[PDB]
């Protein structure tokens, strides 16, 4: 997209994770596992819930009929109610059709940031004691436990912690 | 060899396709319609204090056709109108009928004030007519008198009737002029003198010659009885010059307060609630969209050109 | 020293500039317009069944004018106005005139039927005039008879008229009402003893007194033939009372469908197509907008008061 | 822009670009070259494409005429039409100003992403086997020949295949 | 954000700094010391003066009364008015709703950039001289004085002038 | 350990709340208003050639009225009617009286044009009343002459009185009709004999019949005094046939130009400068909406349903 997060350099998404929108998959000593990051989840859903709001609203404006659906009005009123009628129809039907258009751009991209955003959040914490593969992971040059691993998506890991373990691995 | 974290997006194997700025096949995860294409059949006077009128027209009301009998006065927020509702028993239409109409449909309610109106017994205000049936009788519009002279063929008295309006809220008086099918009808209740009847007020004036000649037949009447109307202000007068032929208030109407307007062919559910409807009946969508109908009323979603639009409620949706 | 790998983006030395909602001079590679400003001086009538009326006017076809003599019936998707349209051999107004234009305009054809009415031969229904020319000779509105006494002073007779509406939807008819300059003029004609036509439909109810009196010369004539219509409902009656000085229909007209009504001065094209139309010709424009006029007909580009929106079509242009 | 890369990082454009948007200039043991990146300049053109085949529309409303070009239409009635008239051409002036401006807006930053998403694409590729001048380009740390480069802009690279001799040359 | 720059990994913002929007915080052996960026100061003002010039504006429509503040206008036409205007009023209402919504989005978004635009030109100038520590700052492992860090600022600072002794301050 | 540099943003400790399409509470650096909320008190008339009615009517200005006696020609760019304004002091109402308003208010300014208009002296022009007094003596709208008989009683002599339009643009010809009180009013002016007033010119043609009567009593006189009123198009005649009961013009009113009509309460101001105006006065914002009132005039914000929109003018304020 426009951040590249999504439908970008990470290949695809996993069909497999339905306990949040962003997530994490480890695969280490102790073994695999998938787990969903909820702080960045929230974040687009909080935004999309806002979007909603805003959207799926009707005006407090009562309208009185001026067509009568019964009798048959003078022909030159009539005339000009259905060109003004048809030019306000037009209008909205354009309103819309670019409020949903621009809406759903924004949609999009709003959440292919909230992934980068995650993605840059993670590569910071790991500073030098990992490298980007490319497909939004990181490969990690030191050892690191189901207790490394969940103290990464704590955003808790130290690199300093590491940092010596890692620097080595990587220079070999 | 290394150990790995990834990072990564949900997604589904059914997503749905919504239209942006770029794309018009554009794949995501969860959407969501904004165009209500659904009614109800039904109209929704839930919480209203509403008046279905069935076959009683608007108008009828003020003059006091048979139909709206039950509709002659009361006080509600929501009017209903009908498809071929009655307004004349006896042929005729009224001068300037949509807006009346409209003033009635936008209005609250009706009160109806007495005119006061006597004549001299060379005066017949008992006059009915076959056309407008009442317990199997021969009657007339209830809030109207038929001035008719007494002796057949005798000149009809000149008269002056003037109501005052004693509310301190504007009063709607209405009237009617008949036209005879042939001067043997005209000379036979108004005599053969020319007529002419003056209406005036502080803030109206207008004369009106009755017009002899026949039309087509309409319930075996080729006569009709035309209506006109105006605003009568408080603590003001309006006065009635007639050489005969004009059919006169027994009850000036007052419009209560504003109520909602519905024409519709839909039934009432007071089950159901709403502050939309059409022809077609009630629409109650959250929704800010609708494609039924550009012929609303009440507080409603804009009407639209489109079928559906999507509107994206996640995001890109990449399958496996 | 080191091998390197350099990424970029193009240009072009003549870039366009557009606006952006914090830019008002950006400048970028290729961009494109969006209001059309330039129009076609022709009318564009491929793949349309369309009528050009000429110096005819609308109107002037229900009453059957000399112009519109090739215009009195037929159908079609498109109708022509042009300026200064004839619709009136002889002097005189339509009365409710832009109603009716608007009403023809807005119809897609028009079919005529016969009102069959026949009249004693003390009345001269084959009454002609210097003011509708037609073959070098005297005539009058094809649509209509001019009802004068066949003896010159003699009163004209007593006449009653009635058209019933045989067809399935409304008719149209028209009729006129006509003025003599002086009493001269009125008695030579009609009589000496005064008019009245009266006109009935279960829908219509009308009088009108003639009126005697010069106005000014118009094609040497100061005497008026103004004309009145009313919708005449199916199986339904109007019923034509006169005296003398009416201008009788031998013709309803019915509006058949609806039809597309261009005021234009621009000439056909029937190699052209369009769905746009104004006062200066035909309007093909993919674009979305235009400036050329508020007055537009069919499916238009939305009139915008800006002589020119670019749409950038590319990236941002940064030369070297 | 919003993304930096255009009008940004990247001192300018390049006249000489005439088969792309978006491309690579290498320079190495074999000299100079250049060569646009098709995939990237689509996606630009792609997104473009679809804005003109939304904007450039009108409806299919049929508009009968409420003003007579030849008769004169009652004072009253012709007041109201000129001012419902107005106050629709101003709304779609603006409507139309407001269209254009933020797709306008929306076209150069989308532009300016699809730079950065294939400069970070390419800086992912190239691992720990170079570094950023700041510029918009990749000083290459290793022997690269056309070979080499043609390798880089197909998406081909392997760094572990250079990677040792990459990061001698790098801590030197 | 959307760039994930401001209310994102940099904690908050400095109530201090009047000189302008963005700016530095340097502390080295001399000691602390601020001092804001002009130039993109600027960018993201340069842009709301814009976004204003554009929004801040009324049309030049010349609008004659169709409704009569004294005299009552007939029920039938005015009833249309009524209708008319307040379907007008409610698209205006609803397209600067629209406006100004999506206008504060961009102008947010916007700056947003403009700092991550700023972060990623001095990540780029400083090369393999310094670190990311995940809150908007660099750890440079060389000694930096009141002249390298005007340096920075000035985007002036030579990766090569301190590079050695950075990159063994770093592998330690 | 490390030496070390930081990025970071601005912020303040009073930021302001602003709307976005995905947070209806996101805090900013610094914000605007967009809609205005506060009037002027005032009408804003600097740098216009302005004309206040105050208790003048714009229909008196052309028949003159005692109140209008200072507004009877003039030129300007803005006409200001007011509430109650006094349009008639003789009691009355003009025919299509709201058109004739739209159409001074519309205008820039006022000609007056003579009709030259004389009597034999069994006629007296000099006609005066009560109603309209003037120099604390009885008179009469300035435009027009009361035609009554010389001697009480006698009948009045039948006259015909014709206006040419001498201009190159088309002026607006006003009249008025009387009607007695009772018969020993009408008998005393004009006599028991019946009065028929025709109008005519190319355009127009009309008959007024005076009607005796009593009528409700305003200002001690019973009796009212009606006007119509045509355009006369250039070089042509209008020609008034009356038997007497015939207000006669004196003066033939021509609109200069176009101006903008403000109906408004509000005191003038030549210090103050704008292009909007409502009841309320002037509006000056350089902002793009207002909710002051959906009735403004000239260059206008467009009125919007909303106390407040407010448009972030910087970033989001994060505070320590
Ligand atoms: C005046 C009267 O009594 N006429 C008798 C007729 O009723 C009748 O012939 C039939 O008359 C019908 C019209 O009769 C009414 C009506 O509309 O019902 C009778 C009404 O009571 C009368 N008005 C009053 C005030 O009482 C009313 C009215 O005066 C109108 O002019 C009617 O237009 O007329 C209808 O025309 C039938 O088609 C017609 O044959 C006979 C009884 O056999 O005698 C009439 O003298
Ligand atoms: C032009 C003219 O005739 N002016 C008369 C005027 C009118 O005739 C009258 O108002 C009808 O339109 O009548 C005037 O006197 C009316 C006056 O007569 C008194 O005797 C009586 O006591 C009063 O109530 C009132 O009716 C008038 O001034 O109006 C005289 C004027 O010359
Ligand atoms: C039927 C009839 O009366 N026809 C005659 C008319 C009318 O009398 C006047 O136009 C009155 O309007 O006048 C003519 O001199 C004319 O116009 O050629 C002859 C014409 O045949
Ligand atoms: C620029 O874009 C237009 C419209 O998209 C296209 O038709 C045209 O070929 C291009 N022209 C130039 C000169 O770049
Ligand atoms: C509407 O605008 C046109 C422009 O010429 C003008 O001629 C017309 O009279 C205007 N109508 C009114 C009633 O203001
Ligand atoms: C338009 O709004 C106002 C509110 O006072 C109302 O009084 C006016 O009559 C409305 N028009 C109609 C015809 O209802």
């Known amino acids: 997209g426009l951040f590249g997060a999504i439908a970008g350099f990470i290949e695809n998404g996993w069909e497999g994770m339905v306990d949040g929108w962003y997530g994490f998959r480890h695969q280490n000593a102790q073994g695999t596992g998938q787990a969903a990051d909820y702080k960045s989840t929230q974040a687009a859903i909080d935004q999309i819930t806002g979007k909603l709001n805003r959207i799926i609203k009707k005006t407090n404006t009562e309208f009185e009929s001026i067509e009568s659906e019964f009798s048959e009005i003078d022909h030159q009123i009539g005339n000009v109610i259905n060109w003004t009628k048809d030019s306000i129809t037009d209008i909205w039907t354009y309103q819309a059709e670019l409020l949903v258009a621009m809406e759903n751009q924004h949609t999009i991209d709003m959440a292919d940031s909230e992934m980068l955003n995650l993605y840059e959040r993670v590569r910071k914490q790991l500073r030098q004691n990992a490298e980007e593969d490319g497909k939004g992971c990181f490969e990690i040059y030191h050892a690191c436990d189901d207790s490394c691993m969940e103290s990464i998506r704590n955003n808790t890991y130290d690199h300093s912690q590491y940092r010596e373990e890692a620097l080595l691995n990587r220079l070999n | ?320």
Chains 1, 4, 5 share one sequence.
């Open chain 2, 1 to 320: 060899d290394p150990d790995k974290i990834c990072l990564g997006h949900h997604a589904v194997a059914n997503g749905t396709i919504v239209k942006t700025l770029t794309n018009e096949q554009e794949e995501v995860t969860n959407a969501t319609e904004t165009v209500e294409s659904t009614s109800l059949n039904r109209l929704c006077m839930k919480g209203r204090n509403h008046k279905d009128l069935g076959n009683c027209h608007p108008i009828g009301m003020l003059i006091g056709t048979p139909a709206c009998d039950l509709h002659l006065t009361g006080t509600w927020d929501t009017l209903i109108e009908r498809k071929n509702a009655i307004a004349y028993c006896y042929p005729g239409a009224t001068v300037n009928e949509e807006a009346l109409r409209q003033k009635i449909m936008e209005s609250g309610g009706i009160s109806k004030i007495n005119t006061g109106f006597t004549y001299g017994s060379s005066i017949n205000s008992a006059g009915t007519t076959k056309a407008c049936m009442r317990n199997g009788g021969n009657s007339f519009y209830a809030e109207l008198k038929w001035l008719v002279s007494k002796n057949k063929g005798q000149n009809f008295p000149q008269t002056t009737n003037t109501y005052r309006n004693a509310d301190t809220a504007e009063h709607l008086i209405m009237w009617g002029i008949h036209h005879p099918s042939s001067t043997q009808e005209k000379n036979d209740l108004y005599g053969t003198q020319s007529l002419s009847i003056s209406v005036g007020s502080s803030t109206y004036k207008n004369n009106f010659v009755p017009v002899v000649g026949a039309r087509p037949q309409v319930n075996g009447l080729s006569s009709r009885i035309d209506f006109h109307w105006t605003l009568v202000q408080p603590g003001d007068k309006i006065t009635f010059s007639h050489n005969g032929g004009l059919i006169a208030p027994s009850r000036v109407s007052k419009l209560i307060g504003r109520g909602l307007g519905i024409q519709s062919e839909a039934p009432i559910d007071n089950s159901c609630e709403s502050k939309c409807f059409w022809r077609g009946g009630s629409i109650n969508t959250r929704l800010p969209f609708q494609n039924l109908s550009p012929r609303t009323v009440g507080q409603c979603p804009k009407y639209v050109n489109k079928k559906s639009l999507m509107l994206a409620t996640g995001m890109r949706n990449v399958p496996e």
